[PDB]
Scaffold this active site. Sequence first.
Site, PDB file in Angstrom:
ATOM      1  N   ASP A  92     -23.680 -23.864 -18.277  1.00  0.00           N
ATOM      2  CA  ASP A  92     -25.046 -23.327 -18.248  1.00  0.00           C
ATOM      3  C   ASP A  92     -25.976 -24.276 -18.999  1.00  0.00           C
ATOM      4  O   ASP A  92     -26.668 -23.900 -19.945  1.00  0.00           O
ATOM      5  CB  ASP A  92     -25.150 -21.917 -18.824  1.00  0.00           C
ATOM      6  CG  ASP A  92     -26.539 -21.299 -18.602  1.00  0.00           C
ATOM      7  OD1 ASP A  92     -27.260 -21.707 -17.644  1.00  0.00           O
ATOM      8  OD2 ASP A  92     -26.909 -20.394 -19.377  1.00  0.00           O
ATOM      9  N   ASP A 125     -23.826 -24.450 -27.524  1.00  0.00           N
ATOM     10  CA  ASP A 125     -23.010 -23.495 -26.772  1.00  0.00           C
ATOM     11  C   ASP A 125     -22.201 -24.158 -25.650  1.00  0.00           C
ATOM     12  O   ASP A 125     -21.941 -23.536 -24.619  1.00  0.00           O
ATOM     13  CB  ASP A 125     -23.869 -22.360 -26.207  1.00  0.00           C
ATOM     14  CG  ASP A 125     -24.313 -21.372 -27.270  1.00  0.00           C
ATOM     15  OD1 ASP A 125     -23.597 -21.214 -28.282  1.00  0.00           O
ATOM     16  OD2 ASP A 125     -25.381 -20.751 -27.088  1.00  0.00           O
ATOM     17  N   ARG A 136     -33.121 -24.157 -22.538  1.00  0.00           N
ATOM     18  CA  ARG A 136     -32.938 -23.115 -23.541  1.00  0.00           C
ATOM     19  C   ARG A 136     -31.675 -23.334 -24.367  1.00  0.00           C
ATOM     20  O   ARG A 136     -31.581 -22.832 -25.492  1.00  0.00           O
ATOM     21  CB  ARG A 136     -32.907 -21.755 -22.849  1.00  0.00           C
ATOM     22  CG  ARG A 136     -32.932 -20.588 -23.782  1.00  0.00           C
ATOM     23  CD  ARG A 136     -32.048 -19.495 -23.244  1.00  0.00           C
ATOM     24  NE  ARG A 136     -30.674 -19.660 -23.678  1.00  0.00           N
ATOM     25  CZ  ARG A 136     -30.115 -18.934 -24.635  1.00  0.00           C
ATOM     26  NH1 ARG A 136     -30.818 -17.999 -25.249  1.00  0.00           N
ATOM     27  NH2 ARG A 136     -28.850 -19.135 -24.966  1.00  0.00           N
ATOM     28  N   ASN A 137     -30.714 -24.092 -23.845  1.00  0.00           N
ATOM     29  CA  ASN A 137     -29.464 -24.378 -24.534  1.00  0.00           C
ATOM     30  C   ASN A 137     -29.440 -25.784 -25.135  1.00  0.00           C
ATOM     31  O   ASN A 137     -28.359 -26.314 -25.435  1.00  0.00           O
ATOM     32  CB  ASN A 137     -28.286 -24.158 -23.578  1.00  0.00           C
ATOM     33  CG  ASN A 137     -27.994 -22.676 -23.343  1.00  0.00           C
ATOM     34  OD1 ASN A 137     -28.096 -21.872 -24.277  1.00  0.00           O
ATOM     35  ND2 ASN A 137     -27.642 -22.302 -22.093  1.00  0.00           N
ATOM     36  N   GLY A 186     -27.472  -9.010 -34.904  1.00  0.00           N
ATOM     37  CA  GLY A 186     -27.175  -9.706 -36.144  1.00  0.00           C
ATOM     38  C   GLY A 186     -25.895 -10.515 -36.144  1.00  0.00           C
ATOM     39  O   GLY A 186     -25.256 -10.648 -37.193  1.00  0.00           O
TER      40      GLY A 186
END
Length: 288
Positions: free
Chosen positions: A150, A168, A154-155, A28
């Site tokens: 990275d 990110d 997915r990012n 969370g």
Amino acid sequence: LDLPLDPLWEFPRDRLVLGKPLGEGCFGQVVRAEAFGMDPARPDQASTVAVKMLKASDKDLADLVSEMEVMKLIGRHKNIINLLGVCTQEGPLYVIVECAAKGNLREFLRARRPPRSSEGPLSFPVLVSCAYQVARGMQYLESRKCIHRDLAARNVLVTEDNVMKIADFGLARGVHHIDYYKKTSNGRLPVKWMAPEALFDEVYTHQSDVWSFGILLWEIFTLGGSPYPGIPVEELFSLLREGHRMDRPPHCPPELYGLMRECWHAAPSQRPTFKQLVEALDKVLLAV
Ligand SMILES: C=CC(=O)Nc1ccc(-n2nc3c(=O)[nH]nc(N)c3c2-c2oc3ccc(C)cc3c2C)cc1
């Protein structure tokens, strides 16, 4: 608490309504939320945002504070996830960013795999546009001296209007303690996106990000495929030492596989820059 007040960014926490969690196994820490009056000219207008919170050690606080301050410094661009505000006073620390409604690009592509029976959702020009937008975002981040470390489908997050937004870029990556065998809860092996100089020599430059962009290009044109299919990490180590590269994907024109292989040239100075990739992909998009 006892964090400095930055009036440029502080947002009243009572204008947030926290919602359902984001991510898969984050206890969370990141949630969707509604915000009211994020635009101070429309104080009662609702908008959907994303909120990151702690919990926490002294170090955990400093990590989030540092991540927040990185986003403050990097400034705004259409193709990154932009900071919108912070809650630092009289309550728990919150970091508020844009919500890209359609989720990450990898899941977006995989869910869209194919009168219009022969027409899947994803056409070649829109795939090229996705790659171009990421390249533009990365070119911005590089101009602000930000190495992502990275970069992967997915990012990259996808907005309601199919705009790509790199996410990110300011997250701590702990590059000196990466479990190269680590498999994420979704089955991802992040070592498969690392440039050789990063994986072998612990060196990162913007050119290492260019290598990862090449892997991301491969993900786009396999509609979210997993790179080095069937190759476990131990074999990836020996294959990269031998100079192995992924095959050309099906239904992928040679122009794009060409760009992929350039991004994976051994010498980092022989990979394109992000500026060159933007221009190269722009030419393909204008070719229609
Ligand atoms: C334990 C792992 C973990 O935490 N994994 C995770 C992956 C994705 C997202 N995620 N997913 C979306 C999305 O689909 N649309 N828009 C978004 N902003 C989304 C975010 C998102 O929210 C944020 C709020 C504040 C800050 C500082 C960063 C973010 C990010 C990256 C959240 C958690």
